[PDB]
Amino acid sequence: QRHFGECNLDRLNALEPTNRKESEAGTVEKWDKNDQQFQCAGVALIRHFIERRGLLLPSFSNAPELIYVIKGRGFQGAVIPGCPETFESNSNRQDQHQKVRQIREGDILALPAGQAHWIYNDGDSQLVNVTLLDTSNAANQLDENPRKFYLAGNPDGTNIFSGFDQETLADSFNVDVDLARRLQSNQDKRGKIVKVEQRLQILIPERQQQEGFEETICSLRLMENIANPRNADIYNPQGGRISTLNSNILPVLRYLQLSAERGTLYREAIQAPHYNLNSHSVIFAIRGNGRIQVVKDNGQNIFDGELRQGQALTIPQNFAVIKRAGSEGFEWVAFKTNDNAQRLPLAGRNSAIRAIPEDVLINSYRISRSEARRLKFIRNETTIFSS
């Protein structure tokens, strides 16, 4: 499983990005991967803002990643090693490439370590991605640095071709030295997100062109929408909804050993106090605000504040956590560091308190039987509590 990191957590802060890299067609923001809570989780978090007609150049990383589409719409092309190109032009009157998928608000995209992909903004809204790079994943045999290996452009030359001699590139591609030198992108000053000329041409149905195991590879599904209300796993009309994404929903996750959760708390509603049995949870606030408390092993509160849109907070494995939305509701995505992440609620239906005999609670807290029965049974909802 995972490599280990230090988890002597005394204090948590809401975390915002601390580095920003501007490209001609967008902005890449990095959270502080050395803040203790991301070191303890073994993760890094990144946000891309891709302007209209922007292209996130192809790259791969040593870390498996989950990418959540905050807003907008576009296309993703993942490059599966060894698999044939199954999208093609009609030769009996050009283009040929691996399958591409439309992406949109609420999509989670899963990318194994080492696999290249590119993303294009096909809409007019900014396309906004939040990516979790899981650097403590068993798939990452390097180290805690989430590296980006760029196949093109000059992200800092600085792409993968930049370090080879052009004679080697020319012979490998079987092209003239003029074109081989182009591979190195020595004179490119556009950064990692670039404007395409006019509109990007790609093969996709009803879009006509103009002018960590491999045993599933080729046919894998890599994306699933977790924001669509029709996919809710938990729903309360005055509390909200929760949707979990795991290997029973998306089989590749069994090899990535990641999960995700998408939550919407209605105004003033509560997500039951709980802890995660078998993973850390990296919460990214999508909209509204939520009061959150996190408690560590010796009972000490290590976070007692609010999480606002654009902020992130890490709940380490087994630390107890409670959330209460503000007057405008609270929406988040959580990235979790295991296959089939599971929550153990501490209050309400299906909770640890409810699983425990009344007699034990009576002696545990020194309450009367009527107090114990109310403790166990007065909140009859599960997970999401109505206001």
Stretch that binds a copy of itself, among 55-63, 188-196, 212-220, 343-351 (CB under 8 A): 212-220
For the chain, percent helix, then strand, then coil, each to nearest 5?
15, 40, 50
Instruction: Count the residues of the shown chain that bind a copy of itself, applying the rule CB under 8 A.
Output: 13
- Say whether residue 214 binds a copy of itself (CB under 8 A): yes
- Say whether residue 35 binds another protein (CB under 8 A): no
Residues 6+ away with beta carbon under 8 Å from 181? 166, 169
Distance CA 191, CA 16 (A): 22
- Say whether residue 197 binds another protein (CB under 8 A): yes
Q: Strands 259-265 and 320-336, how do they pair?
A: antiparallel
- Say whether residue 20 binds another protein (CB under 8 A): no
Q: Which position among 100, 200, 204, 217 is part of the footprint of a copy of itself (CB under 8 A)?
A: 217
Q: Which of 74, 18, 28 is nearest to 190 (CA)?
A: 28
Instruction: Judge residue 164's burial from the number of C-beta atoms within 10 Å of its C-beta, 0-12 exposed, 13-18 middle, 19 or more buried.
Output: middle
Q: How far is the CB of 130 from another protein (least distance, A)?
A: 19
| Choice between 108 and 222, CB closer to a copy of itself | 222
Element (DSSP H or E) covering residue 4: none
- Say whether residue 26 binds another protein (CB under 8 A): no
Helix 369-377 / helix 358-365 crossing angle, nearest 10 deg? 110
DSSP helix/strand/coil, 36:
helix
Is the CB of residue 50 less than 8 Å from the CB of residue 119?
yes
Neighbours of 224 (CB within 10 A): 19
223 binds, among Cl ion, another protein, a copy of itself, none (CB under 5 to 8 A by kind): Cl ion
Q: How far is the CB of 115 from a copy of itself (least distance, A)?
A: 15
Element (DSSP H or E) covering residue 172: helix 166-173
- Say whether residue 305 binds another protein (CB under 8 A): yes
Cross-strand pairs, 148: 61
Q: Considering only residues 58 through 117, tell me which ones interact with another protein, judged by CB under 8 A.
A: 58, 60-62, 73, 77, 79-92, 94-102, 104, 112-116
Q: How far is the CB of 49 from another protein (least distance, A)?
A: 19
| Choice between 112 and 345, CB closer to a copy of itself | 112
Q: Considering only residues 76 through 135, tell me which ones interact with a copy of itself, judged by CB under 8 A.
A: 82-84, 91-92
- Say whether residue 33 binds another protein (CB under 8 A): no
Stretch that binds another protein, among 26-34, 44-52, 236-244, 325-333 (CB under 8 A): 236-244
